[PDB]
Design a protein around this nucleic acid. Structure first.
Ligand SMILES: [Zn+2]
Ligand SMILES: [Zn+2]
Length: 815
DNA sequence: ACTTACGGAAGG
DNA sequence: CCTTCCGTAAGT
């Protein structure tokens, strides 16, 4: 059975009613204004001709934030909103306090009635942050709004030369980024062009009529192109009629760079190439400075001090070129000479799994997971196999929390439990089963107790008061129960005094060939910086990139600006597993050999550089003889699934002949097929009638349940579905089942289900990452994990915050 | 331990 | 109307 959630008293009185059965007049004075709105009087300076005036810096009541009615009815939030008001609208002086965190805040975990505030609120991004420290009327909202309007205006600097038609400059600046002549720029795909010029037989296939959408899952036909890369040759402004430069119409000239897929050698040229490889060209373009989407580093390869592979991993936006590309000669050249020239956090991972989140955090260099809690024994053993210096408690998290909230210091095994002050960062993905939209029993006690573990996680965060807090869940976490779970999580975090925010990320935008949307809740201690969410690194299909959240009919987006394009191309199924040798249905050989070297950039990243020929976990589930014949009869065309299975009699791998599915009832919605045949397999096709417990047909190559219930299940699109080489995986789940809800798990060519190795590669796991158990345990460990590249992007975002805080401390101490 | 049959809300 | 996709419970 499931254990009830351990709570601190703070967390208890917020989630109490939801998990009932599952938890165990002077400047500086605040006034009220008839709508009442609570404002702070920032200045009482009498403006003329309009009576006595005053500047009102508005408060936002917590009920007007994303918290809603979950909020404290006296909590206010600072907002960047103010305006000039008459004095004939002030009702009376109201008392507002600033509840500041104590110096013992990191240990306040575990233990009037006037208006108060403790956090500033960003209403677009739902970001609760520490009150901004803007040092001086002096409206803070006005100062922040000014210092914001003055960083988005592109401005030239360091005039280089003055001709008669245009003024050249050496530098420009835009959105706080500085560009110089010679830097690399990102540009929208539309910024410049390259000189290179770019009937079914309804009686044999009776379920084909259900493919009438033309939409193909995991298809990369509509993904946008990555950024155009350029090198700045000339920053210039055109002169006006007054003979002086137009400092607002800033133009740049650019040497174009080719990607290998941009040359006459098309997309196939990208299969083996480095994801950041370019070709210098002598072609030039002129764009507007407004079009620049970011700065990037484009270096000549064989003039770098280290190896180009060591340069590529050093920082973001790093590209190199070794050769030039003659377009209309369609040749490759040597480039011309005018083209050549902190202590890690202590981390506690609750619901660790095999360790995908810890792996991504480790490769971002921010964290050292010293403690992991994981009840399932195979996943905990895999964590131990991947983290030899970590402590893994193979125990219910509630039991361990109860132990630590007393002076236990040690569990029944002799494992030293973390105490307050020891945990610097708390991360975890609480169980998703009760939140996942695939779960059609989410109102039952099993899913109730699964969902109640969010309260356990928040109680951990309340007790330990870590510097940073990360909650990962499926996308459906943000909308489950009218977003009440998310609202209550954010309410608990604000009540603790955390700066907090939430968002939805797509894993495919960070370097996996998989669509996987995950909700992320980030929180930081009062003295910290609140991390931003990471910018997408890889372009991905737009249908898989729906990341906005509607909470009480209000839309919330993350801070991400790279909506459409990005620096790198998409990872495909070919990039993922094209190197792996052929294998059969039911593979059981754990350690085998690779039949050669890695064939793509992604495979090179996942295997490493050193020659290690031992490939592990290239094992496939053993499907029955009927399922095997079905997987043999799935054609290789992209978008092939059960719906183009043949309705024939098949001599199976044993002494058994699969029969033809009989169509016994007239489906009125689907109508009759062209041959006059019926399309229903049970009496329930008629609206308002019970199933006949005799229409269930057995041992058919076409599964009977799929036509039985397809009309209300999107025709079971994707079931017995093959992957395509040019496309991406669907969401990797704990068990690849051709008849599962997410059942597009068939190899592009081999008559088998995807391998454990291929599922780990869809999740961005290093080939050396150890999994444990039988094949089902390995599939579940892989399908539960956070994809390490996504956790790495988030970790780099937190590293930014750590470095920022350290630098401000060092500047404050070396005055 | 293995196989199958399969609800309903969010958001486009 | 179409697509979403850390899956569960009952049967076997
Ligand atoms: Zn103001
Ligand atoms: Zn029926």
């Amino acid at each position: 059975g499931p254990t009830k959630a351990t709570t601190t008293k703070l967390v208890y009185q917020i989630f109490d009613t939801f998990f009932a059965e599952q938890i165990e007049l002077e400047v500086g004075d605040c006034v009220s204004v008839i709508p009442l709105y609570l404002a702070r009087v920032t200045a009482l300076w009498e403006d003329s001709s309009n009576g006595q005036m005053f500047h009102a810096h508005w408060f936002c009541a917590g009920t007007d934030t994303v918290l809603g009615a979950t909020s404290d009815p006296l909590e206010l939030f600072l907002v960047d909103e103010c305006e000039d008001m008459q004095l004939s609208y002030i009702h009376s002086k109201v008392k507002v306090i600033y509840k500041a965190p104590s110096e013992n805040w990191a240990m306040e975990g575990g233990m009037g009635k006037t208006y108060f505030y403790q956090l500033w609120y960003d209403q677009d991004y739902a970001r609760f942050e520490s009150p901004p420290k803007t040092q001086p009327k002096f409206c803070v909202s006005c100062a922040r709004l000014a210092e914001m309007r003055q960083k988005e205006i592109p401005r030239v600097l360091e005039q280089l030369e003055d001709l008669d038609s245009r003024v050249l400059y050496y530098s420009a600046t835009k959105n706080g980024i500085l560009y110089r002549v010679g830097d690399g720029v990102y540009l929208p795909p539309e910024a410049f062009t390259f000189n290179i010029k770019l009937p079914v037989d309804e009686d044999l296939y009776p379920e084909h009529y259900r493919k009438y959408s033309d939409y193909i899952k995991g298809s990369n036909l509509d993904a946008p192109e990555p950024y155009r890369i350029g090198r700045i040759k000339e920053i210039f402004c055109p002169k006006k009629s007054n003979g002086r430069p137009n400092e607002t119409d800033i133009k740049i000239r650019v040497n174009k760079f080719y990607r290998p897929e941009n040359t006459h050698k098309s997309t196939p040229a990208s299969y083996h190439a480095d994801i950041n490889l370019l070709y210098w060209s002598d072609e030039e373009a002129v764009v507007d400075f407004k079009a620049v989407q970011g700065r990037c580093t484009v270096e000549y390869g064989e003039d770098l001090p280290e190896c180009v592979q060591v340069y590529s991993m050093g920082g973001p936006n790093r590209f190199y070129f070794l050769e030039a590309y003659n377009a209309k000669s369609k040749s490759f050249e040597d480039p011309p000479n005018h083209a050549r020239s902190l202590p890690k956090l202590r981390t506690l991972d609750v619901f660790s799994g095999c360790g995908g989140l810890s792996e991504g955090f480790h490769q971002a260099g921010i964290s050292d997971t010293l403690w992991a809690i994981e009840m399932w024994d195979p996943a905990a053993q895999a964590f131990r196999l991947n983290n030899p210096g970590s402590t893994v408690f193979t125990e219910d998290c509630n039991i361990l929390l109860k132990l630590v909230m007393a002076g236990e210091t040690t569990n029944s095994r002799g494992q030293r439990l973390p105490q307050k002050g020891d945990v610097e960062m708390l991360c975890g993905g609480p169980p998703c089963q009760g939140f996942s939209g695939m779960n059609r029993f989410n109102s039952r006690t099993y899913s109730k107790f699964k969902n109640s573990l969010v309260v356990s996680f928040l109680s951990y965060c309340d007790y330990y008061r870590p510097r940073f807090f990360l909650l990962e869940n499926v996308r459906n976490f943000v909308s489950f129960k009218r977003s009440m779970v998310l609202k209550l999580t954010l309410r608990c975090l604000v009540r603790m005094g955390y700066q907090c925010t939430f968002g939805v990320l797509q894993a495919g935008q960070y370097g996996v060939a998989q669509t996987r949307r995950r909700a992320i809740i980030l929180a930081a201690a009062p003295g910290e910086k609140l991390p931003l969410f990471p910018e997408p690194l890889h372009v991905f299909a737009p249908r898989a990139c729906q990341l906005s959240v509607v909470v009480d009919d209000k839309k919330f987006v993350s801070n991400i600006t790279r909506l459409s394009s990005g620096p790198f191309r998409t990872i495909t199924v070919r990039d993922t597993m094209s190197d792996l040798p052929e294998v059969r249905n039911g593979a059981s050989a754990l350690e085998i050999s690779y039949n050669g070297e890695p064939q793509s950039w992604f495979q090179r990243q996942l295997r490493g550089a050193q020659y290690q020929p031992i490939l592990r976990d290239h094992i496939c589930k053993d499907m029955s003889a009927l399922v095997a014949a079905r997987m043999r009869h799935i054609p290789l065309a992209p978008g092939s699934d059960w719906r183009d299975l043949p309705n024939i009699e098949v001599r199976l791998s044993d002494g058994t002949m699969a029969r033809k599915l009989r169509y016994t009832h007239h489906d009125r919605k689907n109508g009759r097929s062209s041959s006059g045949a019926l399309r229903g397999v049970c009496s329930c096709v008629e609206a308002g009638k019970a199933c006949d417990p005799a229409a269930r047909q057995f041992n058919t190559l076409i599964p009977w349940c799929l036509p039985h219930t397809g009309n209300r299940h999107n025709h079971w699109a994707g079931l017995y579905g093959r992957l395509e080489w040019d496309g991406f995986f669907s969401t990797t789940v704990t068990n690849p089942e051709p008849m599962g809800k997410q059942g597009r798990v068939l190899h592009p060519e081999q008559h088998r289900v995807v391998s454990v190795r291929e599922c780990a590669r869809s999740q961005g796991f290093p080939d050396t990452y150890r999994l444990f158990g039988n094949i089902l345990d390995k599939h579940r460990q892989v399908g539960n994990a956070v994809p390490p590249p996504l956790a790495k992007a988030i970790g780099l975002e937190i590293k930014l915050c750590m470095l920022a805080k350290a630098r401000e401390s060092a500047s404050a101490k070396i005055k």
